[PDB]
Amino acid sequence: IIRGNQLQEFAAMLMPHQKATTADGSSILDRAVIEHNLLSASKLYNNITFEELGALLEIPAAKAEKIASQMITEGRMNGFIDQIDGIVHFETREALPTWDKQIQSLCFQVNNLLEKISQTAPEWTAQAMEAQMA
Amino acid sequence: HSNIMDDPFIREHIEELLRNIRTQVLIKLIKPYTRIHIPFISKELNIDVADVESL
Amino acid sequence: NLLEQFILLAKGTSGSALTALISQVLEAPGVYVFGELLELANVQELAEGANAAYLQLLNLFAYGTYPDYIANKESLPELSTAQQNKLKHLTIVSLASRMKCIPYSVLLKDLEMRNLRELEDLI
Amino acid sequence: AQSIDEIYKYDKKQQQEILAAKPWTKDHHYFKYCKISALALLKMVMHARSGGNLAVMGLMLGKVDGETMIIMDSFALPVEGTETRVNAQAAAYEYMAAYIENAKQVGRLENAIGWYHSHPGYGCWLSGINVSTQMLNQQFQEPFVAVVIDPTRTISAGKVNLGAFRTYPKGYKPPLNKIEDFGVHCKQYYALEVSYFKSSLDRKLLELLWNKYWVNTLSSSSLLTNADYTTGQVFDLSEKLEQSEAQLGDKLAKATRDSCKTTIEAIHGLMSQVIKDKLFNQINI
Amino acid sequence: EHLIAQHSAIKMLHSRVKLILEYVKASEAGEVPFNHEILREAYALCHCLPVLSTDKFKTDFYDQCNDVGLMAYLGTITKTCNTMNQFVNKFNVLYDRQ
């Protein structure tokens, strides 16, 4: 997520036509950065309310929802909007596939740990495998 | 107002328009929502609540 | 993969320079496991003397959590923003180690945050 | 052992008896099962992929048991076919005449049982010329079967894609989903149900050389990857049961077998899930 | 066969875990010069269990169990229907009364 403070220098070197606003007071740079921040927050959040989504995007409460709904209906991001609760949902994990992924990660961790042990003390690993097989 | 919708061929068929385009705008607007306020749709579509409900 | 470069130049220094190096290690981003450095004799010898506070701080950053730096906050040297953020990150890691679904209330209470937005920014 | 060591024991008395009886002459819908060995399957796949987009083909060795055609070996004919047509002009015939004798010398007692042929990129079916050749081979060599393998589709989809077919004799007078999968001659032949088998030593060395995919099985988690396949089997089984009860007024036995197979695979998936839960979720409280 | 296939993989997992446990036990007292990195990774591996012990998972798991149980019940009913059909057929061909 790109805060505006690190973009003041970037806005200075932009060519003038790239610095034009969009008839609402916000230029091109701090609309592309808004969309980028919202897309990147879609990856860090399972869901987020409108007030909180606008808190970290500096867009007060409503244009946050407008931009979030605009990034959808175009395929640019996944998720739906419950306007009654004022919540944008990005991605839901269906428990069992998450269980599969976590089991696979655990097995990969086991394999990596065994590889590290073998590469650290190869003689001990060989003698331990020999003792285990018996 | 006095240029296109004066002959009985466009003036008669304009009522079908402003309804197909409204329908398309409504379809695009409610695509990312799972629950949406009817007054919100009325504000977006510029028509009142009763017309939004009928549409 | 950055603690070794500090250990290489930390093997001869002792005294105030060693404590300054420890503070720099706790300040440097990307360092979250201060175990190999803690095993050095120079760091372990800091218990006797007026530099035991730095050894206590290193032990806190290696095994302790942020609430542990609540009762003895004044005794230990004041931590900068980077050191406090690192300690909060380590507290989050410790919480995630024992539970895979951490409530916001637990994080707010342990990290001493009064705002949900700032807690989420820290996470 | 012993019972699972069967199918590889070849006897000549039974073969002679079924070849002299010729029971297929009366019942044209005789053969319904094609039991192919693992070696034949592997050789067929490698030969089909070796030709790339050019069609290649060869012979088969095997036998007949009841209403089942058993394939135990595969050939490799020296045919130089085009990208859509294989001919076997003069070298394939002498090669297959010599190979049978050479195999007789070493101990291969199985005789010719059919021909396999590659369809590089056009599914598995019998075209007009395939139907003509297979029906000629059946009319003069009565125990026969035509197998077609798609190499490119097998490689792309990651699954073995081959089929076994037998043609009806000329003059066999007796919906819309059988016209795109097969050719215009789809009513001139029928597809045998294809099943694969392996031996005790083959599975022994296969399980012995299974040391890198344990992670895949420990998180395979069927009942989600095969959910669509399972519900397809179920709604086909409902129609099978409807046909069986219409017959009631043995189709019911076949419907029961299919239901048992689907249910057994579902319970196998549940057993895998239970084992995984015991392994990974009942530890550390 | 299915349980033997599962056994072949659980044996490999058990072998790897036992090797890691033996390395930890050896590095504990005096056997092998311990690595801080490997010990920390082993601690993380231990902290990785239980895998998905949430209440949401415990509901989907019983959903799957009940779905497979219903399928098993229907398959059992089908098998019993076939068996009773065979029994009725033999009873009719033995006790045939007109």
- The encoded tokens of residue A103 equal 């089991």
Beta carbons within 8 Å of E31's beta carbon, 6+ residues apart: A124, E25
Evaluate the omega torsion of the peptide bond into residue E50 and state whether it is cis, within 30 degrees of 0. yes
Do A and D share at least 3 CB pairs under 8 Å?
yes
Q: How far apart are CA B33 and CA B40, in angstroms?
A: 12
3-state secondary structure E44-88: HHHHCCCCCCCHHHHHHHHHHHHHHHHHHHHHHHHHHHHHHHHHH
**A chain contacts of residue C120, beta-carbon cutoff 8 Å:** 52, 56
Provide the residue type at D194 as one letter. V
Neighbours of E16 (CB within 10 A): 17
Q: Is A58 on the interface with C (CB under 8 A)?
A: no
Nearest residue in B to A69, CA atom: B32
CA angle D177, D183, D187 (to 5 degrees): 75
**What distance in Å separates the CA atoms of residue E58 and residue E50, rounded to the nearest whole number?**
13
The Cα E20–Cα A109 span in angstroms is: 11
Residue A44 distance to chain E (closest CA, Å): 19
- The residues that bridge with E6 in the sheet, in sequence order, are none
Count of C-beta atoms within a 10 Å radius of residue A31 = 15
Q: What is the DSSP letter of D192?
A: E
* 3-class state of residue D120 by DSSP: coil
Contacts of D218 in chain A (CB under 8 A): 103, 107
CA distances from D211 to A58, A108, D217, E9 (A): 54, 14, 11, 8
Q: Which tokens belong to C72?
A: 């003895």
Residue D24 near residue D172, CB atoms below 8 Å:
no
Three-state DSSP state, A19: helix
E2 CB-near residues (< 8 Å, 6+ apart):
D268, D271, D272
User: How far is residue C42's CA from residue C45's CA, in Å, rounded to a whole number?
Assistant: 5
DSSP string, D194-207: EEEE--HHHHHHHH
Q: How was this structure determined?
A: cryo-EM
- Order of strands across the sheet with A80-82? A47-49, A87-89, A80-82, B33-35
**How many alpha carbons fall within 13 Å on the CB side of residue D219?**
19
CB E47 within 8 A of CB C98: yes
Separation of alpha carbons D116 and D51, rounded Å:
14
Q: Which residue is associated with the tokens 């944008």?
A: A88
Q: Do E50 and D282 touch (CB under 8 A)?
A: yes
DSSP state of A18: G
β-partners of residue D166 are: D190
Other CB atoms within 10 Å distance of the CB of residue E26? 17
Contacts of E72 (CB under 8 A, 6+ apart): D263, D266, D267
Place of tokens 């579902």: D266
Resolution (A): 3.0
Angle between helices A29-44 and A63-71 (to 10 degrees): 70
Residue A106 near chain E (CB below 8 Å): yes
The DSSP bridge partners found for residue C11 are none
Query: How many CB atoms are closer than 10 A to CB C26?
Result: 21
Q: How far apart are CA D136 and CA C92, in angstroms?
A: 77
CB neighbours (10 Å) of residue D135?
A: 21
Closest residue on chain A to E39 (Cα): A113
List the single best residue of D219, D221, D276, D284 to mutate versus A (max A Cβ within 10 A): D219
Chain C residue numbers with beta carbons less than 8 Å from the beta carbon of E54 are 100-101
Q: Which residue of D has its CA nearest to E79?
A: D256
